[PDB]
Amino acid sequence: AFGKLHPTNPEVTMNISQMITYWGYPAEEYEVVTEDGYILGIDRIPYGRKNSENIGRRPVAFLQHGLLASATNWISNLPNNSLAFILADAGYDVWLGNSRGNTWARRNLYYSPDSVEFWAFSFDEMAKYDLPATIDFILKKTGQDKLHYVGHSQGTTIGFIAFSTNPKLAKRIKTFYALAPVATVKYTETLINKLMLVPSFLFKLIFGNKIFYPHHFFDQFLATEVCSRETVDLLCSNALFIICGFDTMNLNMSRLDVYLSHNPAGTSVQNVLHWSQAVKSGKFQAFDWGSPVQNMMHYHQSMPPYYNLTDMHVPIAVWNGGNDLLADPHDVDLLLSKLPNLIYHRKIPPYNHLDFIWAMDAPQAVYNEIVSMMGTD
Template identity: 55%
Template sequence: MGNSRGTTWSRKHTYLKTNSKEFWAFSFDEMAKYDLPASIDFIVKHTGQEEIFYIGHSQGTTIAFITFSTIPKIAKRIKIFFALAPVFSIKYSKSPLIKRAYKWKSVIKAFLGNKDFLPNTSFKRFVGSRLCPLKTIGKICRDILFMIYGCDLENINMSRVDVYMSHNPAGTSVQNMLHWSQLFNSSQLRAFDWGSPVLNLAHFNQSTSPFYDVRNMNVSTATWNGGNDLLADPEDVKNLLPEITNHIYHKTVSYYNHIDFLFGLDVYQQVYREIIDIIQGNL
């Protein structure tokens, strides 16, 4: 199980310290270019399996779309890509977090600088584990969690909200949030815009940041999305699906939001059981 760079479980480096701006100089571009390929190479080397199944959720699908469409040797090692709440564009996203990141991107940059964004601090863990279980505070915790991802009270174990809040959000870089804010209102996915033609030229050998084309990905792909997802909006998913060259399966769960794919009470019946069946049928 992989964890994106900058989260609680992925905050170490061979020589960079987490209090340095160099450590946090990344977005999902670097995750797709370096981290996912390295993870897949590691798995292949240590298991002896030439092909593996990849399951991604949210940004985990974004990274995969980029890697599998730009690095053919990695794409060849993926037998099936299972994309849960797939995110390739956020033109229609209704997520308050994304909207605020777009609206306040200059403020975020000015006040948070070049380091981490929403880290999983000891204070946040204290709030999640000690305060969220309290009846009066619990509603606030629930509202914060659902404001980011969407709300379905009937499909979430509400007695576990304190646990969810203790672990989510797990942190990322300011640069990653700025990258997402650059994509708001856009129907396409593109690399991080460094802010000037000169800097873009240094990074990409062109004056603007390049677009990613999912049509270049030839990996067998199965997708699941939620009808009430605020982040992976159904309209964005609808536009994505025809672009997937080798699309083998799709299902929309009408009442699902973004976190139902992780915490939904019936996620095994709606999603996981189907993934297992597809894997077993392709062994």
């Protein structure tokens, strides 16, 4: 049988602002330019359908997605269960970032997306250039002094790096809301572990030296034709669970077409390679460019420098899942034992890695608590 469970959701083919206006919310596009030339397309929802107060003074909430994802991560479902829309209706001026390399931040001033140099970056550069550039842009635009930073996965990784090496930037973050925080990955539980322990050499032999898993036409075929049909349905949902952990009943099966037609959103092979070094070393450190000389040219050292969570003094609230296979409890716990200004920690036992952005009960489990916390800030 395997018949289409539902007619293709319109969001499947919309870009960020299309989805926002699709739900009746105000959408605004902008693009940041990183010191090193990358052009990042960022989006904003100035007010919500339910709150238009203090226009021009609304507190800023910046949501940063993680590896191979995009800003849609925060507006992937309904207005009542998608963080971005909720923050809007809660009275916030919501900004959604996009990391270099993804669907909407894949353009540089100096290099061609088809050049090797273009994809010669990892989350190091996202922390060092993407964030400063994006946050600086938002605050100069809105006129606010600080903003509320919410990150997910690698979205928190770049936040840890920046806010701990950039004293000036850090001072502009009201509270750091980290969902499925990732500083190290030496205890991840997902099968995709091993693909990360393969020698760098082989990794590049397999994938290449440029783009990594971006959105293809075929991704759309599977998205609209496989993730929408009755039983073949499970191929999509289980591919997601093998990566994030199991919480089968929290995922809206009627929206897999939306999720997979937007994820992955691509990134550099280097970035995934950097994460690979992380899975192997089990440490939290900068990228190894592959030679004392190249690292010299980057760190003035022979070995990339280690990142210190102990120097990340921004008040941080953490939410991690007991069933997350990426931001596993063990790595998260080591991360919590270092953070100097932990203001909050809530471990949601059944939560997996994707729940933080798509769990049908995310509002009650996490979002409402974030709204509450940001409200008394």
